[PDB]
Symmetry: D3
Subunit: 156 residues, 6 copies
Amino acid sequence: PKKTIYFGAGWFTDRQNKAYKEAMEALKENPTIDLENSYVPLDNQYKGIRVDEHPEYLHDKVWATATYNNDLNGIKTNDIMLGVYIPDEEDVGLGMELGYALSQGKYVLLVIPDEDYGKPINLMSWGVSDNVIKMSQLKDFNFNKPRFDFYEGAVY
Amino acid sequence: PKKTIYFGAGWFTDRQNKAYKEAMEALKENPTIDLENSYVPLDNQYKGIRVDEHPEYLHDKVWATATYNNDLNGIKTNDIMLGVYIPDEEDVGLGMELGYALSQGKYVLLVIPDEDYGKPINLMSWGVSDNVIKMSQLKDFNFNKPRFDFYEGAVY
Amino acid sequence: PKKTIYFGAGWFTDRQNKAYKEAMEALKENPTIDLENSYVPLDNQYKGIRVDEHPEYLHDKVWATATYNNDLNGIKTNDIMLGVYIPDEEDVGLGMELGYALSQGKYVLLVIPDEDYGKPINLMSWGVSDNVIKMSQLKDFNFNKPRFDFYEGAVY
Amino acid sequence: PKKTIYFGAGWFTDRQNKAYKEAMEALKENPTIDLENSYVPLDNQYKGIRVDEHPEYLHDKVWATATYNNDLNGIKTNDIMLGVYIPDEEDVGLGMELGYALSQGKYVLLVIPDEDYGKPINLMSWGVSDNVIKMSQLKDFNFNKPRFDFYEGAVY
Amino acid sequence: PKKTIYFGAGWFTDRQNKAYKEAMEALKENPTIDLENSYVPLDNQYKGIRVDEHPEYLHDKVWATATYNNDLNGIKTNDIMLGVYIPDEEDVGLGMELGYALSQGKYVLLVIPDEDYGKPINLMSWGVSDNVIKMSQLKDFNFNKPRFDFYEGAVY
Amino acid sequence: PKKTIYFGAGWFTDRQNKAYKEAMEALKENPTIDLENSYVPLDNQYKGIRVDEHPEYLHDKVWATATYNNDLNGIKTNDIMLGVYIPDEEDVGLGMELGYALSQGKYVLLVIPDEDYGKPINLMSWGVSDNVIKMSQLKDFNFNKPRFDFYEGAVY
Ligand SMILES: Cn1cc([C@H]2C[C@H](O)[C@@H](CO)O2)c(=O)[nH]c1=O
Ligand SMILES: Cn1cc([C@H]2C[C@H](O)[C@@H](CO)O2)c(=O)[nH]c1=O
Ligand SMILES: Cn1cc([C@H]2C[C@H](O)[C@@H](CO)O2)c(=O)[nH]c1=O
Ligand SMILES: Cn1cc([C@H]2C[C@H](O)[C@@H](CO)O2)c(=O)[nH]c1=O
Ligand SMILES: Cn1cc([C@H]2C[C@H](O)[C@@H](CO)O2)c(=O)[nH]c1=O
Ligand SMILES: Cn1cc([C@H]2C[C@H](O)[C@@H](CO)O2)c(=O)[nH]c1=O
């Protein structure tokens, strides 16, 4: 069997965009992941518009509503909630999605870049996760048998 | 009638600490809020110890589990979810809590310092919110008749 | 004690409008209801405008989004879900709201005009309901001790 | 992959029964739908009894309980919540199911007959839906990649 | 303020019946509890009949459905979920109710007779609980500020 | 298609361990069950430690937290909630899981040993189940088409 995922990753910093590409690649190689039918936010912004790339939409209530709902749909409609996590650059949006994933009863997996693994993460992100792994463990992670595990690291 | 709230507010930067004090003062003046029976995270960390004062707790699963659970209990047993929000220093912890509050069906009110009201806020925060007001309106906000409203500002 | 309610009632036919007035009168006489702090949809449409008075809003996503959200907020922040129900003119809107109220764990009480009490009602409405009474009992219903009961009538 | 659905459709009017057959046919041709393991209410009424066809059961608390629970099970147990929607003949039962589907975190798709598409629909039905399409779009709808979209029509 | 509770307690053994009486007495002395408006299962079985007094009801789906539903309604409309717990005679019914209370976001408090406080309790009960105290503390417990705490005892 | 299950069964009595093995066998033969990717508690106790087999962990807050969370994850992450039920030896832990399964929107199937089928079961276990079958019906049960059905037996 294969599972689909909601690709929860930011795209506002160099460290973030770096991890984004890495995780994308790991997923592309993982056998247990049906990446084709997965939902990736950046490719599903309303009307293909990226607001950081079109500041005129910074006040469009309809663009916001549509994108927000689309993201939520991407979460409840897929199997796993994957969060690309950067300890030094924690994203509020990802946080909200972790909480929403919890409500939807999804498996919450946080993936931290190998160089950052161990650094302290926020108490809530730690508590809402079902497991926290390193980037290098992503390609071989068996999504058909998701298990609970503690983050081998600090939590502030 | 009077409502109780969960005081969602970070205390990791000076801007956050300033907003924290202002909000606490506004709430003490609000006739519709019962602050004594509300839940304030900072006075509810497990064993009464803050990890930033006692770094030895950065690696203590028991401390993390209890504090996380106590916070969740603070949201679910209280009427309103209050989030002191600083646009330029958004908190992943507050984000997770907004999602969790949504799952529990609580009114989610964001309060932004007057000087920052209007600056862009994360889409996901705008989405979960039932309303977003400025710090100065907090002391007068009627929590017995909470209603929905859009942020009179930008959202990235 | 006193409870607050969400006034679920259509206003699209004369029978509905008649039932609407009767229920509002019964509620004003109920000592266990706090009507001032309750949510009445008709006084809460976005921007205070009813689409039947201003048809131009029939095509306004912003109006639709805000009004829909405000209604949901009205159900989740109030104690009881009241549904004025007319067996011969059942409302799809009221139906959706019953389902939503169930999801929020609210007591769902249907109130049917005396003259119609007994006529067949949709299975799904009978199912979500915690009790169904006639209009005449509304003024005396004790909302501080709501209990479950079967419709003394038919269900198609 | 293929998805299963809860066939939410009324059967109380000529327009309704017409759309029912049409949608059934569209689903029968859609590649992304596993119609065999889907749940269709009319074939799952308790003991095969249709109350509109056996008025003696109009007062059977056990028949109602069983059918109501069976329908709910049909919803939470399947992937997509499909609602066959007739603007001029909105069903309260379908409404309740849309709300229940929301709580269950299912994708809510409303399908309106091509001749009716555009006509005004109830505010709540509009707001609970993840997407609203035309009958003709049903056969080709890709259920493995469900996305959010606004109804190109009026909402009262 | 005062809170209402759902009195979760078995009455199938002498130890249970003893604990039942002690807890009821402690609750009558608690200034933060409104016992009149609370829900006591034993006074809420359908038609007022207990199946152990009228065994003929052991085979009556209607009795079972109404009593089950009334109990659920008792949990969802009340503030606190109280579970009188006897470690050596754990109740499957109370267990299901703890899970249900968790789903409704209620504070779950277990109360164990002093003589038994400390004995091993089922993992799942320890997990859902927000706190577990001994019978003697019940009369003084402040239900207006419920907080999380670990069982000072064993868990098998 | 095939479905996965959360194997909910006790292991504290001879009758329990007997049914456990039986059900295991039935599942091993059932075509509609993907037993390999299913979650079975006994093989997923934290660190492979069984506390009944290592009483030193009877006070390990970390072992309890981890196992409890792992079990919950096993429930929300799988399709069906299967409960091996012994009428004379009802388990509180299984009860809590039935309630949690309900919240997660899973199909709840109780399987009773053929020799015990008919004996009275707790009102709540009866009410939370979507269907109750005999051990002998397990091997042939079609999990791709789960339907609702009443327990042909007594409920106390
Ligand atoms: C700010 N922002 C955020 C999101 C969602 C997507 C991502 O998982 C996370 C990044 O903050 O939130 C989005 O889709 N669009 C956008 O403009
Ligand atoms: C990081 N962190 C966070 C919280 C909670 C509280 C506040 O709402 C928000 C701040 O991130 O989350 C807490 O209780 N303890 C902690 O150490
Ligand atoms: C169609 N419609 C419906 C509602 C809500 C309110 C009432 O409970 C019920 C009537 O359908 O749903 C509303 O607020 N506005 C609107 O225009
Ligand atoms: C009135 N009624 C209704 C239903 C369900 C099924 C359908 O999706 C919708 C039609 O109202 O509700 C049912 O199964 N039986 C019945 O008698
Ligand atoms: C077996 N049983 C059980 C209950 C409820 C009530 C109590 O919280 C707990 C006792 O099992 O579950 C009840 O109302 N009636 C009944 O006959
Ligand atoms: C007491 N106990 C219980 C459980 C779970 C697992 C099973 O479905 C049910 C048995 O009580 O609860 C567990 O995993 N470990 C344990 O020690």
